[PDB]
Paper text:
To better characterize the EσB protomer structure, we performed local refinement of the octamer C1 -map with masked R1 and R5 protomers which displayed better defined density for σB. We determined the cryo-EM maps of both protomers at a nominal resolution of 3.8 Å. Although the cryo-EM map of R1 displayed better resolved electron density for σ2B than that of R5, in both maps the σΒ C-terminal domain density was absent. Local resolution calculations of the R1 EσB map showed that the central part of the Mtb RNAP core was determined at a resolution between 3.4 and 3.7 Å and displayed well-defined structural elements. Domain σ2B was determined at resolution between 3.8 and 5 Å. Superposition of the EσB structure with the published models showed that in EσB, the clamp adopted a “fully open” conformation with a rotation angle of 22° relative to σA-RPo and a clamp-β lobe distance of 28 Å. In EσB, the β flap tip was turned 111° towards the σ2B and β‘ CC that is equal to its 27 Å displacement (closed flap state). Thus, σB4 could not be correctly positioned for the −35 element promoter binding. We concluded that the fully open-clamp state observed in EσB is characteristic of RNAP inactive state in which the σ subunit regions 3.2 and 4 are unloaded from the RNA exit channel. In the EσB structure, σΒ1.1 did not block the main channel and thus there was no physical barrier for dwDNA entry.
Author numbering:
A (entry chain D): 444 to 1011, 1026 to 1127
B (entry chain B): 1 to 235
C (entry chain C): 837 to 1149
D (entry chain C): 446 to 787
E (entry chain D): 1226 to 1281
F (entry chain C): 28 to 53
G (entry chain E): 28 to 108
H (entry chain A): 3 to 226
Write the structure that this text describes.
């Protein structure tokens, strides 16, 4: 706002007013600024040019909570913002305020321009996946503009008889004119010649032999006009795409852009995509009305059938052959089946062009459960204890509930609201302690030269064939640093040591067929104080190797503590795990390696351990409430339940539960 | 020229053949008043000439490739539409293209009668293998805008004339963005940025001048409806 | 007494009380004056609006009258909501109300030929016909049903030009006013009752460059009416340490807050154009040193080699 | 509305009661016996949730301190117009039915099996030959605030809570308009809030002026009602009253004659009627924003008035006595232009 | 953290000297924190124009 | 009709006739 | 090959980081050069033979720090450490 | 192809009027009407009140004896007064009345050069024994200016700044009839409907809009 920028930048304005001879002395200049004479506004836009400020959104959770920015004067009395960074501030627009700080010295201005600029922090410190992506309306705009409908005007028509090919356009410059006139709709399949967009990695091979594609070479593509428009926003040289821009597709495209290109190109691309998405969302025809919400016509039949079953069950109870617990179980199962059935019917009924289905399907917002509640039927509602009411809620919010049904729904949601209220402080209580413990960890030396590392399983080769990708690949060893060169059973090495794992490196490694890799970690880092840069790995915000001196403890503390809000085990489990108290389950372990035998009775469990190599069998006595922990025996089948004769290694957990960290320490090692 | 506080001035930034025109500062709420109307006039009110329909000697049904050529009929059409022309007489004229023997066909091989010219002879059209006869008849007409894909659907005969959509206007692509800027104290005066890319027929500045002339002549009809009105003056 | 930072308006009433005029007062005082300042506020950005069904929101932009989309008749809409927020919250009721609002605004006349229709069987005869903008009621857990509302939407009166603006489904064909082309698809339009909550922006916006300082702690005052500055909580301290930012943190803690010598020096340097001088040493540290020395614990600050230093002056 | 709802609030905190940290999750959620006594939807959304409730519409308090609700007497499939008030235990020991169950115009049930609530919150179908009591009105369980929300049964409970907690935060505008779709409760709400002057005894209007209204009774006696103008409320808004009647207009006792703030023609009016459209629009209403037309700023459809108060007081110091004076030490007269001699 | 008297007196007896290598202490005093742009490696950076650049 | 307050504006309502008693003194 | 950057961003951070090993060093590098430039611009009014001023043409009264970063990017400035 | 310069036709009703422009190029009868609408509703000069003085009062938030409505409602009613003027200086009008009745805009006494175009308006209901005496300032301009832009003059304590709506135009709309049968015979006929506030006849407003647009577009035709 003007009325605030004239207050933060008061001394600079005074100086430049006294300099340009609009005021003789400082006192007159200060008077002029305070009275807001029409001379000042000319100076104000000059002084604040490219002078960054800092925006913070109290309370701040993670290191992206305070970010630099460049100011722009604007009318009104509110601080505008760029939509993409809202998720960075986790701030919606119900009236949440923000604080503005201003740096003065040359050091502070340079530091705010280089380190803390918003355009440079696109990558989340936790995972490395960019968090500045199209979010709510951009997603549905793009999902509309890139959809294809098989029955629209201007569609492709193969030649037949006296009518030659209609629907072939020389260049998209002509296609846009055609759409403007009113003959071509932007979602109809056509063949168009392209001259600036690199064809997909496959078509290029046939059409060009990889002699080298160049800007200016022509080819022909079967697309809609929409995908041609959407690919003109991605950077020059990125291969053409042909896919409906669901949420996941955009995620993948943005990830590739982040990995294979500098940050600036990614930022400019994301801005262009936002602009196009907003401009094309308005015309999407996404409107909600009472007509769009449609009630399935077969609901009555299903309701009466399951009601007949339920009343028969209740009569069988009235005959004395059933217990109350049986009554509750039978009714719960019947009504769960009924809700699933009406949900299936509803999913079938709605045409794909419904605004509700368009909103929920393209990954914008919500689930299908909310739509089922809105249209089909409520289902089952909870109790203050935590059980399910035997009586269901047949009515749907479109059709309107009754007094008693609404009463029970009211009984429902207040518990959730109270839990949401209570979890707020417990989310950050952990973060405070974590930052307390690990504030002195700083990258100090560039290397340790020590080759001790750790072993990580990249993938799995199932006996069925080919390879099975490890689900934990993107966390455990996605962005580590190697310690030893990568070579397969063949004599040709694939990746040399010291080369950080990326996405191309990981994919190539999996293609060459490697399973276990040795990588450098931070546990084995050999330095008395702090850690080492190389042993640490690749920074999660820059995307390249971490710099010397960067604080690393605080980043980890924030990263662990931030997502604690979205919990429900849980936060107490995390607290127990870090504080390392004695666990509740208190599972046993195989202090001596060997086979396991069951001698348990009905009251307690008496389990014997027969050492493989001499030794003496060691027998544990425990409670019979715990079940045996299934051990993947040498038969390679983890479904083999623990039994006498199963073969286990040293320290194997015997029954289900969580072990004492101290015993595992003194048995195995660090 | 005093009632308006500030007089807007049209700048110009050039590149190869496209250009950017900046107008600033317009009175608040005028950027979209000018941008969209100016864009539409630029696209669809600049008279020019274009190829209407083609005739090929040896074709009965148009789907199959012409004998003795490499590019299909469709690629012939796509190459031919891009070719630019410029005629003076509004009545249609006819162009003849003749080629024989192995080699390649350029645009310069078109022999135009008086009053009709081709501005980019160096355009690849088709490749002919050994012993290939290619005789094409082009119909060149004048007008404005962009005709549909098929100029005439019910109009036809056994002559084999193929109707072809034509891009009459010499302007290809026009986009515009509207930003904010400040004058005096109010900080919402519109500034218009207009990007225009055209053919080799007309330089962009001349196209913009023609568009402005057309629009002012249109609004003069509303102006003359009453001789004496106040309005607003600018410099 | 001066008008606090932010207030404005016109004085409308002055009450003067004096002890000598037989008026009861608290002990120790003689004259007490109350002055009332009134101001007529408007609506702008930042102000908070809300419907009755808990769909709150904040004003984002106040477009000129000609930019708003307008119906076919030519009356621009007064407010534009968003549709991505209805299905998630399940406050579908507002949509129903919106439809009914239009039915109330333009009035309806159900056709009584061939008897009353099936959906008009239970509808009381008072609601068969209605004049334009005639108010109606709808008791909770009773009142208008979906069939009745659907029937009403199809039997609405035309405007003064013999046109029906809205359709059977409740939507209408708007025109984009910013460009000119009609919207490709019909849009939902109606009348809605909208309030104005009491979280106004003009009592939240606040700025400060250099003003009063507290006389006890040597820190700037708090609140808005005291022309104070903004709290800098420890979480921001962690967030600044995370970036590797050092000079910014030291400056935000030393020469801006409680360096009694540094602040004047930086003001003079800025207003004169020279380089910002180095930070001094915060008053909090000197307070800590005095508190420690008052407990008989000799604390002194050594130099790098080992030579003793003093922070006396 | 804010005052009316504030007067009926039931608070579980306070001296002699459990503290904020004493309260657990057992003393916050709705118990099945709240039906008709404490409204289950209205409650502050902050940390005090559950502890603070609102009394229902029809509840009244028995002499001992328990809360009674009305009911209708049903003998044997016959509904009587006698109304009997019951406490919690009596409602426990009997059987009761909903009020929206179909009835015949003669006074008999139609369907054999009707829906009935029973003890411990159970609800089931039961033949019509043993139903003891039938409720009065469908709105028997809602507070006053939540009774003014149209189409209440179509909204989720969570959003209905925020809908009921925002009418208590509105702002009176310069010239108010009655809503197009109301729920009928607002008339009684306004007339019992007490902020609208209501004629005590019938008569005719003699002199009507912006400051006072004079009415002569039937017997010839006269009365003059004074009306507060631009008086400060507690939260800074303006409390203004205006007449609606005119001279020579016959009025009857109990009829409103001067609407207060947030009232038009004796009905609770809090906002305006705006023409709305439902559509995303080039990103200015992304994530719960609202776009307004400049017409609202033009025709001041939504302008309010705020009145602040400033207080000064001169006491007797030990060095003398402070005195309100016009001669400030060394202040230029241009600063002191707007003061009087005092 | 806790029991300030205990740690204070225990440090007092031993005449313990604290080297400001941490982030809580350096932020209590007000010195540049020894992380990021505050370490001694970068603090004593000198910068001069190259000899190739000169004023004609 | 259903209104008890004299002179109040008429407000036609969707309802089923229900009148054992009116809302008590609030 | 990217679109020409606007305002603060130019010169882009990557091209800058090509010429300096570690970004923390870049911060102090730019800060000290900017201090020198401001000092020269301060003394040019009343003194001679100060530190050498900007090595590239300043625009219409732009900040010294922008000049420092711009002239680092063109590699007109050496680095010692 | 076809070369037909456009033509305009006028149809008149009581206060609103229709204007038909034909024949326009395909896909161009929309933006033209939209430009006319965006100018007609924002840049038509007019005249309206900017300040009033009431005897015996000092500020707006109060009342006066003998009047059924306090000063705020008097200002609110006076806002929608329709006044037409041509002098380029702030002119002054008077309004006084006494005795019972209804003080309407008809009782306004205008000086030479300004006119009031709605004597049937209603300003206040004057009770017996109530005087009323006000003095009005009328200016010219365009668009809209907030009232507080006039309080900086620092004039006497009696002057009450008042908002202003200089725009006379009330409602504007358009329709397009498209002849789109596939030939060279495709064109758009634009029908523009205009209604104003009984102050300025519609044709004059259309002329003003045309002149503003002509002046604006003229800066593009000049070459380098
Ligand atoms: Mg919020
Ligand atoms: Zn290491």
């Amino acid at each position: 706002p003007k009325l605030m920028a004239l207050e933060l930048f008061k001394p600079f304005v005074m100086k430049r007013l006294v300099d340009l001879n609009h005021a003789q002395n400082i006192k007159s200049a200060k008077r002029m600024v305070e009275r807001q004479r029409p001379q000042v506004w000319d100076v104000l836009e000059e002084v604040i040019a490219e002078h960054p400020v800092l925006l913070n959104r109290a309370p701040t959770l993670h290191r992206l909570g305070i970010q630099a920015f460049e100011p722009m004067l604007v009318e009104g009395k509110a601080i505008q913002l760029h939509p993409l960074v809202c998720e960075a501030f986790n701030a919606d627009f119900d009236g949440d305020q923000m604080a503005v700080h201003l740096p003065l010295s040359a050091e502070a201005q340079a530091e705010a321009r280089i380190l803390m600029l918003s355009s440079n922090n696109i990558l989340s410190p936790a995972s490395g996946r960019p968090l500045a992506m199209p979010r709510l309306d951009m997603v549905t705009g793009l999902y509309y503009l890139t959809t294809e409908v098989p029955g629209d005007t201007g569609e492709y028509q193969p030649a037949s008889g006296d009518h030659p090919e209609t629907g072939v356009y020389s260049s998209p410059a002509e296609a846009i004119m055609a759409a403007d006139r009113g003959v071509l709709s932007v979602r109809a399949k056509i063949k168009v010649r392209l001259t600036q967009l690199r064809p997909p990695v496959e078509i290029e091979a046939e059409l060009f032999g990889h002699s080298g594609w160049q800007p200016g070479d022509a080819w022909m593509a079967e697309t809609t006009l929409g995908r041609v428009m959407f690919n003109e926003l991605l950077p020059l040289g990125y291969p053409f795409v042909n896919k409906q821009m669901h949420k996941k597709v955009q995620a993948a495209i943005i990830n590739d852009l982040a990995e294979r290109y500098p940050m600036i190109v990614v930022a400019q691309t994301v801005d262009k995509l936002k602009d196009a998405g907003f401009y094309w969302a308005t015309r999407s025809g996404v409107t909600v009305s009472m007509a769009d919400v449609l009630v399935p016509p077969r609901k009555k039949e299903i309701l009466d059938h399951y009601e007949e079953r339920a009343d028969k069950v209740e009569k069988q109870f009235q005959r004395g052959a059933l217990n109350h617990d049986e009554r509750n179980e039978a009714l719960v199962e019947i009504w769960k089946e009924a809700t699933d059935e009406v949900g299936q019917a509803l999913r079938e009924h709605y045409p794909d062009d419904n605004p509700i289905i368009t909103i929920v399907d393209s990954g914008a917002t919500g689930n299908f459960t909310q739509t089922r509640t809105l249209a089909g039927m409520k289902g089952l509602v909870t109790n203050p204890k935590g059980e399910f009411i035997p009586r269901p809620v047949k009515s749907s919010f479109r059709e309107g509930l009754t007094v008693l049904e609404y009463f029970i729904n009211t009984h429902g949601a207040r518990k959730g609201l109270a839990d949401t209220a209570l979890r707020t402080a417990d989310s950050g209580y952990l973060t405070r302690r974590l930052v307390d413990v690990s504030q002195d960890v700083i990258v100090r030396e560039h290397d340790c030269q020590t080759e001790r590392g750790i072993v990580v399983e990249l993938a799995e080769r199932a006996p069925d064939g080919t390879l099975i990708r490890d689900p934990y690949i993107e966390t455990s060893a996605y962005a580590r640093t190697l310690g030893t060169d990568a070579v397969d059973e063949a004599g040709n090495v694939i990746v040399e040591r010291g080369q950080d794992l990326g996405d191309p490196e990981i994919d190539a490694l999996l293609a060459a067929g490697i399973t276990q890799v040795k990588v450098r970690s931070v546990l084995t880092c050999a330095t008395s104080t702090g850690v080492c840069a190389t042993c640490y790995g690749r920074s999660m915000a820059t995307g390249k190797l971490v710099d010397i001196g960067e604080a690393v403890g605080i980043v980890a503390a924030q990263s662990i503590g931030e997502p604690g809000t979205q919990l429900t085990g849980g936060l107490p489990r995390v607290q127990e795990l870090f504080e390392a108290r004695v666990p509740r389950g208190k599972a046993p372990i195989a202090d001596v390696t060997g086979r396991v035998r069951l001698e348990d009775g009905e009251r307690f469990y008496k389990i014997t351990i027969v050492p493989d190599d001499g030794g003496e069998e060691v027998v544990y006595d425990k409670i019979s409430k715990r079940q045996r922990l299934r051990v993947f025996k040498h038969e390679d089948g983890s479904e083999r339940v623990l039994s006498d004769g199963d073969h286990v290694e040293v320290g194997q957990q015997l029954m289900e539960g969580s072990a004492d960290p101290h015993e595992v320490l003194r048995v195995q090692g660090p | 020229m005093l009632i308006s506080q500030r007089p807007t001035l049209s700048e110009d930034v050039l590149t190869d053949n496209r250009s950017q025109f900046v107008i600033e500062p317009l009175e608040p709420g005028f950027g979209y008043t000018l941008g969209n109307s100016l864009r539409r006039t630029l696209l669809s009110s600049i008279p020019g000439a274009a190829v209407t329909s083609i005739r090929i000697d040896g074709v009965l049904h148009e789907f199959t490739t012409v004998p003795g050529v490499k590019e299909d009929v469709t690629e012939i059409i796509l190459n031919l539409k891009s070719l630019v022309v410029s005629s003076e007489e509004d009545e249609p004229v006819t162009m003849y293209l003749r080629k024989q023997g192995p080699g390649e066909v350029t645009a310069g091989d078109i022999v135009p009668p008086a009053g009709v010219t081709v501005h980019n002879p160096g355009m690849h059209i088709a490749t002919l293998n050994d012993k290939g006869k290619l005789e094409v008849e082009l119909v060149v007409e004048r007008g404005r805008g962009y005709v549909p894909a098929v100029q005439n659907r019910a109009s036809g005969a056994e002559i084999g004339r193929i109707p072809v959509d034509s891009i009459y206007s010499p302007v290809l692509k026009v986009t515009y963005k509207v930003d904010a800027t400040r004058v005096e104290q109010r900080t919402d005066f519109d500034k218009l940025i207009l990007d225009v890319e055209t053919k080799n027929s007309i330089s962009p500045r001349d196209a913009l001048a023609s568009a402005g002339k057309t629009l002012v002549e249109l609004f003069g009809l509303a102006r003359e409806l009453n001789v004496e009105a106040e309005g607003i003056e600018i410099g | 007494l001066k008008v606090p930072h932010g207030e404005s308006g016109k004085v409308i009433g002055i009450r003067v009380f004096s002890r000598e005029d037989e008026d009861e007062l608290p002990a120790g005082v003689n004259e007490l004056v109350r002055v009332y300042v009134a101001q007529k506020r408007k609506i702008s950005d930042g102000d908070k609006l809300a419907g009755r069904h808990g769909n709150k929101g904040v004003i984002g932009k106040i477009l000129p009258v000609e930019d708003m989309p307008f119906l076919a008749d030519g009356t621009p809409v007064d407010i534009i909501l968003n549709t991505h927020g209805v299905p998630r919250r399940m406050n579908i009721g507002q949509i129903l109300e919106t439809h009914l609002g239009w039915c109330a605004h333009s009035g309806w006349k159900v056709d009584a030929a061939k008897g009353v229709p099936d959906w008009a069987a239970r509808l009381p005869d008072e609601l068969l016909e209605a004049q334009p903008n005639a108010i109606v009621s709808t008791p909770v857990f009773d009142g208008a049903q979906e069939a009745e509302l659907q029937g009403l939407l199809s039997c609405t009166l035309p405007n003064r030009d013999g046109d029906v603006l809205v359709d059977a489904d409740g939507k209408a064909m708007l025109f984009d006013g910013r460009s000119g082309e009609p919207f490709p698809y019909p849009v939902t339009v109606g009348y809605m009752y909208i309030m104005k909550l009491h979280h106004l922006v003009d009592d939240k916006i606040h700025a400060r460059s250099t003003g009063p300082y507290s006389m006890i702690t040597q820190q700037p005052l708090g609140g808005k009416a005291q022309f104070g500055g903004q709290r800098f909580g420890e979480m921001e301290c962690w967030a600044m340490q995370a970036y590797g930012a050092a000079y910014t943190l030291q400056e935000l803690l030393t020469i801006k807050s409680d360096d009694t010598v540094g602040r004047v020096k930086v003001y003079e340097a800025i207003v004169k154009g020279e380089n910002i001088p180095e930070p001094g040493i915060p008053e909090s540290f000197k307070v800590l040193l005095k508190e420690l020395q008052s407990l008989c614990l000799n604390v002194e600050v050594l130099s790098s080699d080992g030579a003793a230093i003093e922070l006396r002056e | 509305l804010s005052g009316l709802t504030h007067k009926r609030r039931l608070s579980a905190l306070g001296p002699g009661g459990l503290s904020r940290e004493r309260a657990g999750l057992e003393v916050r959620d709705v118990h099945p016996s709240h039906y008709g006594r404490m409204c289950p939807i209205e409650t502050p959304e902050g940390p005090n949730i559950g502890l603070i409730g609102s009394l229902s519409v029809y509840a009244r308090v028995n002499p001992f301190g328990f809360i009674e609700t009305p009911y209708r007497k049903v003998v044997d499939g016959v509904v009587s117009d006698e109304i009997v008030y019951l406490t919690a235990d009596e409602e426990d020991r009997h059987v009761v039915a909903q009020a929206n169950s179909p009835i015949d115009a003669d006074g008999r049930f139609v369907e054999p099996r009707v829906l009935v609530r029973r003890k411990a919150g159970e609800v089931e179908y039961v033949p019509s030959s043993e139903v003891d009591y039938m409720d009065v009105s469908p709105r028997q369980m809602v507070s006053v605030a939540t009774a003014m929300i149209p189409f209440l049964e179509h909204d989720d409970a969570n959003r209905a809570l925020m809908g009921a907690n925002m009418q208590r935060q509105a702002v009176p505008l310069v010239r108010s308009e009655a809503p197009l779709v109301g729920t009928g409760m607002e008339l009684r709400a306004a007339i019992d809030a007490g902020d609208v002057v209501v004629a005590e005894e019938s008569g005719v209007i003699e002199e009507v002026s912006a400051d006072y209204i004079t009415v002569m009774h039937d017997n010839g006696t006269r009365r003059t009602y004074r009306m507060r103008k631009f008086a400060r409320s507690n939260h800074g808004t303006c409390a203004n009253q205006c007449p609606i009647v005119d001279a020579g207009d016959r009025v009857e006792a109990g009829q409103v004659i001067a609407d207060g703030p947030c009232t038009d023609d004796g009905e609770m009016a809090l906002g305006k009627n705006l023409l709305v459209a439902i559509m995303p629009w080039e990103g200015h209403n992304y994530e719960d924003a609202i776009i307004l037309s400049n017409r609202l700023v033009e025709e001041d459809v939504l302008t309010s008035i705020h009145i602040e108060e400033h207080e000064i007081d001169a006491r007797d110091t030990k060095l003398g006595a402070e005195e309100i004076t016009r001669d400030i030490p060394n202040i230029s007269d241009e600063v002191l232009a707007d003061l009087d001699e005092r | 953290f806790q029991e300030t008297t205990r740690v204070l007196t225990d440090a007092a007896i031993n005449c313990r000297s604290d080297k400001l290598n941490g982030l809580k202490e350096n932020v209590i005093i007000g010195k540049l924190i020894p992380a990021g742009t505050g370490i001694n490696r970068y603090r004593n950076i000198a910068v001069q124009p190259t000899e190739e650049a000169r004023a004609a | 009709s259903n209104n008890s307050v004299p002179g109040a504006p008429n407000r036609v309502s969707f309802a089923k006739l229900r009148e054992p008693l009116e809302v008590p003194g609030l | 090959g990217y679109d020409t950057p606007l305002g603060i961003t130019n010169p882009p951070i990557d091209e800058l980081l090509d010429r300096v090993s570690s970004k923390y060093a870049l911060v102090i590098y730019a800060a000290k050069r900017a201090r020198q430039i401001n000092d020269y611009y301060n003394q040019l009014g009343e003194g001679i033979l100060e530190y050498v001023g900007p090595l590239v043409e300043p625009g219409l009264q732009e900040k010294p720090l922008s000049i420092a970063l711009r002239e680092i990017h063109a590699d007109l400035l050496e680095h010692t450490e």
